[PDB]
Amino acid sequence: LTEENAKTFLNNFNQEAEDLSYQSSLASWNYNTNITEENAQKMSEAAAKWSAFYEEQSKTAQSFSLQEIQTPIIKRQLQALQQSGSSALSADKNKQLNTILNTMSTIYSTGKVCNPKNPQECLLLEPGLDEIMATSTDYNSRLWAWEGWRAEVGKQLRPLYEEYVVLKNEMARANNYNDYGDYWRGDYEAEGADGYNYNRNQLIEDVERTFAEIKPLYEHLHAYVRRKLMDTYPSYISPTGCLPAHLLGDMWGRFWTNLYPLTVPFAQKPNIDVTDAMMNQGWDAERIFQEAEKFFVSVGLPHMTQGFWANSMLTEPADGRKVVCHPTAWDLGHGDFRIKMCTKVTMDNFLTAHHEMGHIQYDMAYARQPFLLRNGANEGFHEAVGEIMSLSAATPKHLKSIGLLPSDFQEDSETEINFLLKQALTIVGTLPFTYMLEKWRWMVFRGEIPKEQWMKKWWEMKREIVGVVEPLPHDETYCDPASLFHVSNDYSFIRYYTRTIYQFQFQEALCQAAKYNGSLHKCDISNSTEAGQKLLKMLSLGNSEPWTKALENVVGARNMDVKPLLNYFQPLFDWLKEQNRNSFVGWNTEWSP
Amino acid sequence: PNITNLCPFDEVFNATRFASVYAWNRKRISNCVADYSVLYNFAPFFAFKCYGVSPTKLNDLCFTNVYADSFVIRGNEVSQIAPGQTGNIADYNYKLPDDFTGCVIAWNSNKLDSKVGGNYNYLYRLFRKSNLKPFERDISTEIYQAGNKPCNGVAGFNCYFPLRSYGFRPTYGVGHQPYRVVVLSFELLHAPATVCGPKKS
Numbered sequence: 117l118t119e120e121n122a123k124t125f126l127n128n129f130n131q132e133a134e135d136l137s138y139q140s141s142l143a144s145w146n147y148n149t150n151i152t153e154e155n156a157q158k159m160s161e162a163a164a165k166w167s168a169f170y171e172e173q174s175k176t177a178q179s180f181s182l183q184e185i186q187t188p189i190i191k192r193q194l195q196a197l198q199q200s201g202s203s204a205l206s207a208d209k210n211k212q213l214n215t216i217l218n219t220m221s222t223i224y225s226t227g228k229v230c231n232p233k234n235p236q237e238c239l240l241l242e243p244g245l246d247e248i249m250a251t252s253t254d255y256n257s258r259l260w261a262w263e264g265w266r267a268e269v270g271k272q273l274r275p276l277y278e279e280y281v282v283l284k285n286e287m288a289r290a291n292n293y294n295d296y297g298d299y300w301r302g303d304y305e306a307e308g309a310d311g312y313n314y315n316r317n318q319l320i321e322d323v324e325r326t327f328a329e330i331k332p333l334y335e336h337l338h339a340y341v342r343r344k345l346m347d348t349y350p351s352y353i354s355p356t357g358c359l360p361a362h363l364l365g366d367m368w369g370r371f372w373t374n375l376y377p378l379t380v381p382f383a384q385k386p387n388i389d390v391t392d393a394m395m396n397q398g399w400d401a402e403r404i405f406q407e408a409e410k411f412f413v414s415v416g417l418p419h420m421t422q423g424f425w426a427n428s429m430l431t432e433p434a435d436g437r438k439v440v441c442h443p444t445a446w447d448l449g450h451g452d453f454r455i456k457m458c459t460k461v462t463m464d465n466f467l468t469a470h471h472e473m474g475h476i477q478y479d480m481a482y483a484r485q486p487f488l489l490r491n492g493a494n495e496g497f498h499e500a501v502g503e504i505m506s507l508s509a510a511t512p513k514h515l516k517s518i519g520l521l522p523s524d525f526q527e528d529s530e531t532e533i534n535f536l537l538k539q540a541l542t543i544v545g546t547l548p549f550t551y552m553l554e555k556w557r558w559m560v561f562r563g564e565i566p567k568e569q570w571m572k573k574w575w576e577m578k579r580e581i582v583g584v585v586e587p588l589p590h591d592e593t594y595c596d597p598a599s600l601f602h603v604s605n606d607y608s609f610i611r612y613y614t615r616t617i618y619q620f621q622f623q624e625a626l627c628q629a630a631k632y633n634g635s636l637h638k639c640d641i642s643n644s645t646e647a648g649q650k651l652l653k654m655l656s657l658g659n660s661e662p663w664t665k666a667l668e669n670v671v672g673a674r675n676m677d678v679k680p681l682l683n684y685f686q687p688l689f690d691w692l693k694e695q696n697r698n699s700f701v702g703w704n705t706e707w708s709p
Numbered sequence: 710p711n712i713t714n715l716c717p718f719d720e721v722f723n724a725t726r727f728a729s730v731y732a733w734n735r736k737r738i739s740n741c742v743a744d745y746s747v748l749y750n751f752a753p754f755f756a757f758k759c760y761g762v763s764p765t766k767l768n769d770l771c772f773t774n775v776y777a778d779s780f781v782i783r784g785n786e787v788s789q790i791a792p793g794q795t796g797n798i799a800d801y802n803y804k805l806p807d808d809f810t811g812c813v814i815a816w817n818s819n820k821l822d823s824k825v826g827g828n829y830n831y832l833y834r835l836f837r838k839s840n841l842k843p844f845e846r847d848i849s850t851e852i853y854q855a856g857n858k859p860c861n862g863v864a865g866f867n868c869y870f871p872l873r874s875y876g877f878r879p880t881y882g883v884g885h886q887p888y889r890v891v892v893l894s895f896e897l898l899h900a901p902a903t904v905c906g907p908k909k910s
C-alpha cells in the first residue's frame with residue numbers, strides 16, 4: 117500500500133539524510149571557524165553531495181500521491197520533501213538564474229561609490245559607507261552617499277532584476293504557484309485539522325490587518341522623530357511632510373536605531389549599559405554563556421550539552437585562523453549543537469548570547485521529531501524565540517538578580533521612556549519598511565505593478581506607508597529596492613514582520629504564565645518553570661503541526677495579534693501622545709521640504 | 710575450598726573489538742566460578758538494569774549456563790535492550806524474551822568506537838519483513854522488497870539495503886555516541902548447575 121511504502125521510504129531517507137546533513141554541517145562549521153581554500157572546497161563537495169541527494173530523493177518522493185495517505189505526520193513529511201524549489205525549471209534556465217543570482221551577490225558585495233572630484237576616496241558599503249549612514253550628521257554627505265549608492269547599484273541591478281523577476285515567476289509557475297510572491301507566501305500555508313487551516317492569500321490581509329493598528333503608534337513615533345530631526349536639520353525637513361530617505365540612520369531606513377542620540381528623550385539619564393560592571397567583576401565569554409545557561413535552566417529548559425562547551429567557539433581564536441564575526445547557532449545533527457560567536461565582554465554580546473542560546477534551545481527541543489520536521493513552525497518562530505530571550509535578559513530585574521546591576525538601583529520613568537524609545541526605533545520603525553518592501557515585491561511578482569512603472573510606484577508607497585520621501589526624483593532607470601541585501605540576494609522579508617509580532621505575543625503569553633503583575637517591558641521569565649513548560653510545548657513540536665496550532669499552544673490564539681506589541685509600548689505610546697499635542701501627527705504625500 | 714578458574718569476563722567486557730548489533734556476538738560461559746565483583750566495581754556503566762535476579766545476590770544464586778551477548782548500539786537505543794520493547798534494535802537486531810532472567814550492561818565507548826572521519830564498522834538492520842524472535846540473529850544481506858515489484862538484487866526505489874552503518878563520530882550528542890552492551894542471560898536446566906560464584910569461610 118502507498119502509505120506503508122511512504123513510511124519505509126521516509127525511514128530510508130531520514131537515515132541517509134541525517135548522515136549527509138551532518139557531514140555538510142560539519143564541513144560548513146570547519147570552514148566558518150577555519151577559513152582556508154581546502155575547507156572551502158570540502159564544504160563545497162559536502163554541500164554538493166547533500167543537495168544532489170536531496171533532489172534525487174525529492175524526485176522519487178513526488179511519485180507518491182497524497183490522496184491515499186491518512187496519517188498527517190507522514191503527509192507533512194512528504195509535503196516537505198516534495199518541494200522541488202528551483203529544480204522545477206530546465207537546466208538552462210536554472211543555470212541562467214544561478215548566474216544572475218551569483219552576479220547579483222558579487223556585485224552587491226563589491227558595490228562601489230567614489231567621491232566626485234576626489235577619485236582616490238572610493239568607499240565600500242561594509243567598512244565605510246555604513247559609518248557615514250550611522251554616524252554622520254551632515255546633510256550633503258548623507259545625500260551624496262545615499263544617491264551615489266542608489267545610482268551605482270540601481271543602474272547596474274535594474275536589468276538583472278528585470279530578468280530575475282521573469283525567471284523566478286517561471287520557477288514559481290512550474291511549482292503550481294501564481295507568482296514568486298505566492299511561492300514565498302507558501303511558507304505560511306498550514307494544512308491541518310479544522311480551524312487550523314491557513315491559506316497563502318489570507319496572509320496579506322492578516323499583515324494589512326496587523327498594520328491597521330500599528331499605524332497610530334508608528335505615526336506618533338514618526339512625528340516625534342520628525343520634530344527631533346527638524347531640531348537637528350533646521351530647514352531641510354518640513355513639519356507636515358515626510359522624512360527624507362537619507363536621514364534615518366541606516367542606508368535604506370530599515371532600522372531607526374541610529375537616530376537615538378539625535379532623538380533621545382532624556383539626555384541626562386544614562387542608558388542601562390552594564391559593560392563596565394562586567395569589566396570590573398572579571399567576566400569573560402565563558403561566564404556570559406554560563407549565565408545564559410543559568411537563565412535557561414531557571415526557566416525550566418534543559419542544560420547545555422557537554423559537546424556544546426567542548427566544540428563551540430566563544431572567543432576570537434587568535435591562533436592564526438580566520439573566522440566569521442557573525443554569531444550563528446548551529447544544529448549540526450546527531451545531538452551536536454554549537455554556537456559560533458566572537459564574544460567580547462559587553463552587554464550587547466550578553467544579550468546576543470541569550471539570543472543564540474535561545475536558538476540552540478529551539479533546535480534541541482525538536483530533535484525528537486523526524487528529520488524533515490526539524491525546523492521552525494514557520495520562518496518567524498525561530499527568530500521570535502530568540503528575541504524573547506533577548507527581551508527578558510535586558511530587564512533591570514534580571515540584571516539586578518545576577519549582580520551586574522546594583523541592588524539599590526532605582527527605575528524611574530525617564531529611563532523606561534528612553535529604553536522604550538530605543539526599542540521602538542529598532543522594532544516599530546522597521547515594520548512599515550518591512551511591510552512596504554514585501555508589498556512592493558509581491559505586487560511586482562504578481563504583475564500588479566507595470567514593468568516600466570516600478571520606481572514611480574515604490575516612492576509613492578514609501579510616501580504613503582512608511583512616510584519617507586525621496587530626496588531627489590528617481591526615474592525608472594534606477595532600481596532603488598535592489599540596493600538592499602535581502603532583495604538582491606533572493607531572501608524573503610516578511611519573516612521580520614511576523615517575527616516582531618510573534619515576539620511580543622510569546623512574551624505576553626509567558627509573562628501571563630509566570631503571573632507577572634506589572635508592565636510588559638519590565639517582565640522577566642526567570643525562575644518560572646511553568647512559562648518554560650508552556651514554551652517547551654511549542655518548541656518540542658517543530659513543524660510537525662500547523663503553525664497556528666503551535667501559536668495556540670503558546671498564546672491561545674491562532675493568528676497574528678499586535679495587541680501584545682501595543683501593550684509593550686503603551687507607556688511610550690502615552691508619552692508620545694503627550695508630546696504630540698501641539699504638533700501634527702501624520703505626513704503629507706506631496707513632496708514637502 | 711580455594712578459589713580458582715574464574716569465568717572469562719575479561720574477554721567479554723574488555724574486548725578490543727565488539728560486534729555489530731545485527732551480528733551480535735554470543736559467548737557461552739560454563740564450568741567456572743563467576744564473580745560479579747569486577748563488574749560492580751566498574752564506574753562508567755550507564756545501565757546495569759537486571760531482570761529476574763537482584764544485582765546484589767548475583768554471587769550466591771547459581772546457574773547452569775551464562776550467555777554473554779556483546780554488541781554496540783547508539784545511546785538512544787539502550788532502552789530497547791529490555792523485555793517488551795519495540796524499535797529497530799528490538800524488532801530487527803536483538804530481541805529479549807518477556808521472561809528474560811539476566812542483566813543488561815551498557816557503557817559509553819567514545820574513545821574506542823568513534824572516529825573523526827566516521828566509524829563505518831558498526832552496522833544495524835533497519836528493514837526486515839517480520840520481527841525477530843527472542844535470541845535470534847539475522848546476518849542476511851538480502852535486498853528488502855518493500856513494494857510489489859521484485860527487487861532482483863538491485864537497490865533503488867522500494868528496494869533498500871537492510872544494513873545501515875552507525876557512522877560514529879566523537880562530536881555526536883550523548884544519545885548518539887557508541888555504547889557497548891553486554892547482556893548476561895542466566896539459564897537453569899535439568900543438568901547440574903556448574904556456574905556458581907565464590908565461596909567464603
Ligand SMILES: *[C@@H]1O[C@H](CO)[C@@H](O)[C@H](O)[C@H]1NC(C)=O
Pocket residue numbers: 150152154437
Ligand atoms: C585549520 O585548517 C588547517 C587546514 O589543514 C589545519 O591544518 C589546522 O589545524 C586547522 N586549525 C585548527 C585550529 O583546527
Ligand SMILES: *[C@@H]1O[C@H](CO)[C@@H](O)[C@H](O)[C@H]1NC(C)=O
Pocket residue numbers: 414513517642643
Ligand atoms: C532564581 O533562583 C536563584 C537560586 O539561587 C536566585 O539566586 C535568584 O535570585 C532567583 N531569581 C529571581 C529573579 O528571583
Ligand SMILES: *[C@@H]1O[C@H](CO)[C@@H](O)[C@H](O)[C@H]1NC(C)=O
Pocket residue numbers: 718719722723747748751
Ligand atoms: C578491564 O580493564 C580494567 C582496567 O584496569 C580492569 O579494572 C577490569 O578489571 C578489566 N575487566 C573488566 C571485566 O572490566
